[PDB]
Paper text:
To parasitize a phage, the SaPIs employ a transcriptional repressor, Stl, which in addition to repressing the SaPI genes, senses an active phage infection by binding to the phage-encoded anti-repressor protein. Here, we show that the phage satellite SaPI2, which does not encode orthodox anti-phage defense systems, provides antiviral immunity mediated by Stl2, the SaPI2-encoded transcriptional repressor. Stl2 targets and inhibits phage-encoded HRs, including Sak and Sak4, two HRs from the Rad52-like and Rad51-like superfamilies. Here we have focused on two recombinases, an annealase called Sak, and a recombinase called Sak4, belonging to the Rad52-like and Rad51-like superfamilies respectively.
We struggled to obtain a good quality cryo-EM map of full-length Sak80α. The full-length dataset presented two major challenges: severe particle orientation preference and the absence of the flexible CTD, which is a common issue with Rad52-like annealases. Consequently, we decided to focus on a truncated version of Sak80α where its CTD was removed, Sak80α∆CTD. The data set of Sak80α∆CTD exhibited improved behavior. The 2D averages from this dataset revealed stable ringed structures of different sizes, with octadecamers being the predominant form, which was used for the final reconstruction. It shows the groove commonly seen in SSAPs to accommodate ssDNA in the outer surface of the torus, known as the ssDNA binding groove or ssDBG. Truncated version of each protein where their CTDs were removed (Sak80α∆CTD, SSB80α∆C7), proved that these two proteins coordinate their functions via their CTDs.
Residue numbers in the entry:
A (entry chain A), B (entry chain A), C (entry chain A), D (entry chain A), E (entry chain A): 4 to 131
Write the structure that this text describes.
């Protein structure tokens, strides 16, 4: 068949967490399923220059913008790349203004952006 | 036949949400239908220099203008590219002035601009 | 025959909205009719430097002038290009002074300029 | 015969509006008559540097002079170009001083300058 | 015979207006008579740098001098060019000082300078 249809036709319902009334598939499950399909696949978290620090060659792993925070994750399986963006959010799914976000929030957003970019491939597309 | 007519003759009415009295087709449905027609298609969100931050090589994913906010999405299916613009808007469909928009608003506008650019292709043109 | 006469001899009266006592043909209808005649046609919205912001490589999609706002749309069907200009206007068809226009107004003016440039081709010339 | 005589010998009286006691032929009629004679003809609205704004590569579609406003339209039919100038005027046909003209006034003057330049060709010369 | 004698021996008395006790032949009549004699003839309105505005590449269509206003028109029929100058004047045929002239006055002076330059050719020389 094809990668999209094979991956799309799977049930990731069992490995999900209901937090805030939303459904999330854990990254651990996503990491193994793609690993099975393709043994060698790449996950890259983009790094962007920081607006406040002017030191040269200083690149943080997230985008800080005057309006908030952004993350980017690029998942490449079998020579196909799917990029994704996401806003960093609170535990209550509310936006975080400049200077109100901790490093633990960014890491959670980075992990969440990975499982969503994988959903651009057939796996668990129905949840999003 | 042709891509426009094939895509135009589909019913996307079932997968729609009535919010504020407007009809919207979910991106998830748009992502799969184009994926079926063409296995390898590209979605690109344009990035523009930011008016307030003067750091070099700093590119946000939206356009901030003294009059408001703009987003752009370019969808390429089978070597044909359809670009689209849209204003970032509130939950009540009202405009957001400079310094009043959160990152969650931009992401929603980005997703909405994707399904509208896909409607430039035959799919779900009737809604817009 | 010829493109002008074929396009000119059509009834776009059914797909019109009477707002403020003026007659407007919806863009959706214009997008499909030209798409039928020519499968591959281009719509380009011109981008102009902004008078107030001095950042380099900053190009907004409209013209802000000390006297008001202008938009431009270039529609190319079958290797023929028809450019058009229009003033951005209120819901009451009144002019908007510098600093009084929202991004929702510009987008409406951009869509309206598209259907008028298409009317430079035979389609719906009688309305304007 | 010749273009001037053919075009000159036409009755554009039916398609005229009596406003302020003057006679005007609508642009829509002018656009179709020249289109018939010549399928491919060009209309160009000249763009001039603006006296107040010093930004580079900033070109408005009208001429603002310390004494008032000017517009220019160049109509080319069958390899012959007829340029024309006109002052931007009020609804009462009075002059507009620097800083008193809206974008709606400029557009009306641009359309009027087009039908007058076409009158340099035989069509509707008698009105002016 | 010759262009001067042929053109000189015509009666333009019928197409004249008596304003302020002077006789003027309308431009419309002049435009058609030369058009008949020569199908392709050129009218050029000279453009001069403006004394007050220092912006580069800014050229108005008239000459503003500390003593008043001047216009120039060059009419070329059959490879012969006749230039002409004229002062911009009020409705009462009085001079206009720097900063007292509107764009409507300049346009009237431009049209009048055209019919006088044509009178350098035989047509209607007797009036001036």
């Amino acid at each position: 068949q094809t990668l999209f249809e094979q991956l799309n036709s799977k049930n990731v319902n069992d490995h999900t967490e209901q937090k805030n009334g939303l459904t999330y598939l854990a990254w651990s499950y996503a990491h193994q399923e793609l690993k099975k399909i393709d043994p060698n696949y790449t996950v890259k978290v983009h790094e962007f220059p920081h607006p406040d620090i002017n030191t040269e060659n200083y690149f943080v792993p997230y985008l800080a913008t005057p309006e908030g925070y952004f993350v980017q994750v690029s998942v490449t399986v079998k020579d196909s790349t799917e990029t994704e963006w996401l806003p960093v959010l609170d535990f209550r799914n509310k936006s975080l203004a400049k200077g109100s976000a901790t490093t633990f929030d960014i890491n959670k957003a980075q992990k969440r952006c990975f499982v969503k970019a994988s959903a651009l491939h057939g796996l668990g597309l129905y949840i999003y």
